[PDB]
């Protein structure tokens, strides 16, 4: 029932479309920067030179504790990329554990489609493993340094909180967007039980999906297709991204379930918004979506179920009218499944690195209505789940 990490509760701001960020300080004296929380990468980097979208940036010449690694680094993401210079410096998380650590920092000097206008963040915190760090795995990720240099338990958990309606930059600034609990699990952030799935391999936070349902109906594909090439949990990706074949089958089924209303192809491709008169969004015509994940017990699985309140992303109207509008936050992928922010907004997610597993529980801040709620349920007797993993 009780929440025991109050200092870190509500330490995030942001929204699915622009990322969730936590305040951090780098250097001596401390330079404050807003840093996006990215479980899909492993490099800690911060803008280190002016940019149209940055209000502030890291000034190495003003930090007495700055150490130059004299080495360049380049990091490309599914969308966006940056070029930077490596070094180390002291880092702290004001609303985080009360420790300061020396960590690797890539000072971003050039970038393309990386920073977002009005996002309010100026850096990125890649929380995944060394295996995918650039230039290579010799560059210790921030979380690893943190755990090696302190007594912080080797675990962190994320409660990303979507508002369910749009927020402009000033509202994002003044609102709580969630929590990143470093070193533990805060029980006030979820309801029900935590169910855990194994981390298949420590590079991205990779998991195995063994079954997919749309309003209880089995998509009925070879489960290998669901993880075709990999399935990862990524706080830095807006959408639920699915391998091309799974995306097409899912969209067909979601269109069939919501067919009482018809939407332009642009809507299903994630490109155009759809609007309804204030308060009339027809939540009940859209289906719930269930992802079944391999359990920790042999032949056991559990499922996490989200609502259209999670996969329909609120966006501001073209004329900022009083209509309630959204974009379809499910899109195709050529690099496997990505359980992005719209999935994470339904749940409290525990990245239990020490025990190589990821925990899911219904979030205390997930958006829902009076008829349905997100769910995490189990167990289900499931067979040959490792066959679902792609090699």
């Amino acid at each position: 029932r009780r929440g025991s990490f109050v200092e870190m509760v509500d330490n995030l701001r942001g929204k699915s479309g622009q990322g969730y960020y936590v305040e951090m300080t780098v250097g001596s004296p401390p330079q404050t920067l807003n840093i996006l929380v990215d479980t899909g990468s492993s490099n800690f980097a911060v803008g280190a030179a002016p940019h149209p979208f940055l209000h502030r940036y890291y000034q190495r010449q003003l930090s007495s504790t700055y150490r130059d690694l004299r080495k360049g680094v380049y990091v490309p993401y599914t969308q966006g990329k940056w070029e930077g210079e490596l070094g180390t410096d002291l880092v702290s998380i004001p609303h985080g554990p009360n420790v300061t650590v020396r960590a690797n920092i890539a000072a971003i000097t050039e970038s393309d489609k990386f920073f977002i206008n009005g996002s309010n963040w100026e850096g990125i915190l890649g929380l995944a493993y060394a295996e995918i760090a650039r230039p290579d795995d010799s560059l210790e990720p921030f979380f690893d340094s943190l755990v090696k240099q302190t007594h912080v338990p080797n675990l962190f958990s994320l409660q990303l909180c979507g508002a369910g309606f749009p927020l402009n930059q000033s509202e994002v600034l003044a609102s709580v967007g969630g929590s990143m609990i470093i070193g533990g699990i805060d029980h006030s952030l979820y309801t029900g039980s935590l169910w855990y799935t194994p981390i298949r391999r420590e590079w991205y936070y990779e998991v195995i999906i063994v079954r997919v349902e749309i309003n209880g109906q089995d998509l009925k594909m070879d489960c290998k297709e669901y993880n075709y090439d990999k399935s990862i949990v990524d706080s830095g990706t807006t959408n639920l991204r699915l391998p091309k074949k799974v995306f097409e089958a899912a969209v067909k089924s979601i269109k069939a379930a919501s067919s009482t209303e018809k939407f332009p192809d642009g809507f299903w491709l994630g490109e155009q918004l759809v609007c309804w008169q204030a308060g009339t969004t027809p939540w009940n015509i859209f289906p719930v979506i269930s992802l079944y994940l391999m359990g920790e017990v042999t032949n056991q699985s559990f499922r996490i179920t989200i609502l259209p309140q999670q996969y329909l992303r609120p966006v501001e109207d073209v004329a900022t009218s009083q209509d309630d509008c959204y974009k379809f936050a499910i899109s195709q992928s050529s690099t496997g499944t990505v359980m992005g922010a719209v999935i994470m907004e339904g749940f409290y997610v525990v990245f239990d690195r020490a025990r190589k597993r990821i925990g899911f529980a219904v979030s205390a801040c997930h958006v829902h209505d009076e008829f349905r709620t997100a769910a995490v349920e189990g167990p289900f007797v499931t067979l040959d789940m490792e066959d679902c993993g792609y090699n």
Binding site: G19, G40, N43, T78, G80, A133, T238
Partner: peptide, 7 residues
């Protein structure tokens, strides 16, 4: 939209 390390 954000789509954060390559592929």
């Amino acid at each position: 939209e954000v789509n954060x390390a390559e592929f």
